[model samples]
Target: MYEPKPEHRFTFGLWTVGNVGRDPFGDAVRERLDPVYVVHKLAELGAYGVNLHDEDLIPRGTPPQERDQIVRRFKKALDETGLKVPMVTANLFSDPAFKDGAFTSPDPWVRAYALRKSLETMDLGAELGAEIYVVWPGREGAEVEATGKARKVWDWVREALNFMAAYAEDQGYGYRFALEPKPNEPRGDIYFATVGSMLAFIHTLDRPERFGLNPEFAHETMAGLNFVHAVAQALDAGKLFHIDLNDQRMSRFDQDLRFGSENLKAAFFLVDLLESSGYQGPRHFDAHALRTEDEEGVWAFARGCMRTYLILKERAEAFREDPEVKELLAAYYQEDPAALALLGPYSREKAEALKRAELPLEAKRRRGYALERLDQLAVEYLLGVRG
Candidate 1:
């Protein structure tokens, strides 16, 4: 019953499912799947669709005609499988041209190339009926302060995004640019290191409404940050346009563990928040199987990612519906309307009333929230014991 369905709106990137079990210290242990094969398999697994970067489907030095052939066949696969492409991005960090950075590169030529590539990716995504364009500035950082490019980065990135926003508007692509933040890995310190950082930068753009966040679960977890809290901020700001669902350990290189593998509690709470918060977007798994795995392991990893999501989603619902859980929460958040009346939109009269209100300071300090009971109830539900 927990099997995923297209209605669940689950997705995976070509780069994710097609990951070849390669790492910095290792070579590929499994052959890369053809784009066509990936589409069919993902569709068979009940996935809604797939996402991709430019390099994921097309080789770097492919000729124009060959590129067209690849895209046409890829579309054929999509048609045969009824899978959709809802998001697309470009590989900015892998190319040698972006050794320093792409959007924030010090070199003018590199910056120009980055813009052109991104614009073309938008065109490509439009061709595939993709409405979301993700921009992950992976190499946008510095290893040394001697170059003195840190201060200049803000202006360069601003210009780059402004250009893309203008291009998308002019071309009528109807694309919402989703900025994915990364703390580090390929670089020592990636720019826009968190969701809040990206959110603040969005206001500086030429079209703030055209941009939002694509925060990844592992990316935030790798930096030892709370992914759910970061997502909460994005959701509250009305900017959580997309999200990457995967698991990872705190303070590690991008583990990209299958969903709900490493931290069950975090994943459970994440699914709970996303479902409860009415986030109407794809639950895209931007991860892959472990390097020690083969092709069979790959598909299992993909299946587990979706299956675990559905399981946790059900658990979250039951947890919320439990009688004692509700009772504890009601007690935990017991409200005092009279005290609340003294707070909020202030005027001189309200301020005078606030000074005169006799709040019971002793009771406020001594009151218990019963949160310990609520937390234990949540744990029981997560463990499949309560519900």
Candidate 2:
């Protein structure tokens, strides 16, 4: 019912396209793809941008000269395709040196190496004119036997972020760092394991303004938490710098399903929040194709993700403009005098009035019913049962 515009930019992680699908329980199901081809294919599929980890673009053991040449080739492909790099991060978790952790590793040498590698990736991102540098410390956690030292790990994370921010500032990158939190995966427990924890830790940084959040939908759902609620908190704190749009079922592993493939209602609300909040950053997908798909299937998967997002975005707009929905929202605010009085400015006079204000139980009950009805209407709209 809604048409997608070309002006909207969509970005996907290069690793998603290049994935060979080798998991702990299986071998590779597909051949690895060249980064240059991945870029070109994404542009052909109508995407405006792509993001990558440093290793995703350049092999880890590549010599300096070869690495420079590879980077130039990738940049050339990007220019030719008109696709931009919205963000880039370091792959700190894959290397064996980080079996314990990266930033929060007990081994000082490992921590130092992690910092150097992160700086290298940050510089690479700067060269590509990236706007956000994401840090997903997947290995920065402890096992069950080695827990109960959160304070020390928190301090180490704070120090690492401060160091990276200062280095970026010195280099004139002008890009911000986005921390992506997950409850656990490679370890038993992780520091700053939730959006709220990361928000609290950002206050301890030397430049809190230089740091924001990159909330991932699968990561939130994997923890059995509400993905929209996590995003709402980040938005409320003004820390939503970037986002990863993938789907996963609650209390399961990180399936990284294509966007809108699961939890349709939550995904709809997330898109609504982004549209209504005037979010200007890229709608990046940190998802991957199913292991069973071939190369062509992978491309189809990518296209499907973008199309689903556009469709839901149009539906969100329609829901906002529906007359019945508008009337329902308007009645809640207009008919409840106590709720109206609660919107008064924060001052001594308003505070005294609020303290003495007699809240009518009947009005409160009606307001609750109004919200329930609004939610029901949204469900109907999503189901195509109502306008």
Candidate 3:
């Protein structure tokens, strides 16, 4: 029901390098890439915000006093570069402290420590004026087979979430929390690996007032669910807290590659739906390209994603505007053969057919024309295009 008006800007951001940590292979990137420089690079690429994870800001084994200094420096960089940290998360699975899992750890102390770290990260989000904090339960499952403890893990997570939710409410801040569902990885199988599973967990908490879903793109595909359909379900539930944009190969697991790089149809479908639904949030990139050494390559890949989004926007607008095509879609859904006849340029039939066919020669011509038209439209319409 909430249709997005087209005038507002659709902003984007990059997950800061802290998630990847300091790679010895990319020492040059390490030396040059600080929070300040990353912000500058993002601004240069026209990004509206950046995502920060706790470990990215607080290096390993940082003392309390030094941690304060680091936080201050990061705050200063945000001030100077005009880039906002719209969302921050705690890496509950990354460090040795969470080897047995964070919130779901059998050890009470480890579980307590995880909650403490999440609180610190939430505090950072508050300071930065971020509206959401994400929790991806990457390491919260058994490798083999387990039963009784799995139920207990859910209870632990619910209590941990309640504490954070209560804390946010008490502070008079409207901070929301999102949970990302991954099927397997650090664990052989995660408990909340599906949207339905996540929704069930949220219902158990019975607090739509404080929590929602963060559904990552690859994670849904990795879980053997239709990613765009999952997005619709989240939106319908009124629980779409945040989203992560990354494409992945159909096989294997969650690769988190740059958007539109793999599974193009699925990515376009998602982008179109998000646009139609009027999602007004940062299009945060969570891509992890293990091949390239050049940091600029990452930016280039991000730009490709932007280009892909723009293309889909154009196509979607065309579809919406064409009355002839709309009628054709209606006919098809209604199973009318007469409606199928109208499926060419003016009909949904034509559009669907075009999408299906190979169109070798026409494809070449359209490809050239589409690119040219896009360039011209970018210059004519986009405010920052000329720059």
Candidate 4:
């Protein structure tokens, strides 16, 4: 029953599953998986789609004819397997030209190149029938604030996004941009370093409604924030267009560990939130096999990511139907009618009455929420000993 299926809307980026075990301190340990092979394997594993950075499918400086051939081969694989490309991104960070930044780069020429590359990526994604464009400005930060470039960065990044939005509108690509946030790595400090930051930035854009957030599990956790709460905020704002479902160890490099491998409770709650919250976007695993894994292990890593999420999703469903859980939650949320009445829209009469109301502050302060009992029951569900 926990088997993944296309209806699950699970996805993985080519750069994610194709990670060759290379790190800054080491060279690649595994061979690159061909994009066509990746499509077939993921289809077999029941992924709904595969995402990609522009360079993941096409390397830099490929001739137009060769690129067309690559696209033809890829499309043929998709046709055979019924795999989809739901999202596409740009590889703005890997190139040396973006060492300073992409959209936030000090050089106008570099920024122009970044914008052009983004437009090209949109063109390719449109060909693949992708409607989501993910923007992870990996190098859009600095090791030094000496340049005071950050002062200009907000405007620069806004200008770049405004241009991209206009392009998508002009081309009628029907794309929605998902801004992925990372606290740090590849830069000492990234400007849009949190989902909240990106949430704020989106509203400041020229086309605010065209943008949303793609919160990563590791990104918020890396900064010691609760990933569940971070996602809840995104959901509350209706800005959770996509999510990166991977596990991580706090205070470490972006681990991108297999889903639920660490912090099992948080992963469980995240699955609960997603399943219950009506989020219909792809459940993309923006993670990789551990550096210690070989090729077979890579496939296993991918399988486990999907399986864990499915298992957790079932547990969350079980929790909802559980009688004891329902009781505790009902009690936990028990509201005082008089206080609730006072909280309605403020008429001057209601405000004056509220001011004079004698609330039962002592009883509330003395009440026990039974939260410990509720949490223990949840832990049992996760442990497979409860409903």
Provide the TM-score for each candidate, comma-separated: 0.99, 0.94, 0.78, 0.99
Q: What are the RMSDs of all candidates, in order?
A: 0.9, 2.1, 10.5, 0.9
- How well is each residue in 174-260 modelled by candidate 1, as lDDT tens digits? 999999999988899887799989999999988999999999999999889999899999999999999999988889789888999
Give the CA lDDT, 0 to 100, for residue 375 in model 1. Answer: 83
Flag regions of model 1 displaced more than 4 Å: none
- Candidate 2: the clashing residue pairs are none
Question: How many steric clashes does model 2 contain?
Answer: 0
Predicted candidate 2 versus true structure: per-residue lDDT over 157-221, tens digit per residue: 88888999999889888888899999988787776689998888888899999999999999888
Could you tell me the lDDT of residue 263 within candidate 2? 87
lDDT of 4 at 187: 93
lDDT of 3 by residue, 155-200 (tens): 8988899888888888876788887888777688887787778877
Q: Is candidate 2 or 4 superior in lDDT?
A: 4
* Cα TM-score of candidate 4: 0.99
Judged by whole-model lDDT over C-alpha atoms, candidate 2 comes out at 0.86
**lDDT of candidate 4 over 304-375, digit per residue (tens):** 999999999988899889998888889889887877888878799898998899988899899998988988
Stretches > 4 Å off in candidate 2: 1-6, 145-148, 335-357, 362-368
Model 3 segments more than 4 A misplaced: 1-32, 333-387
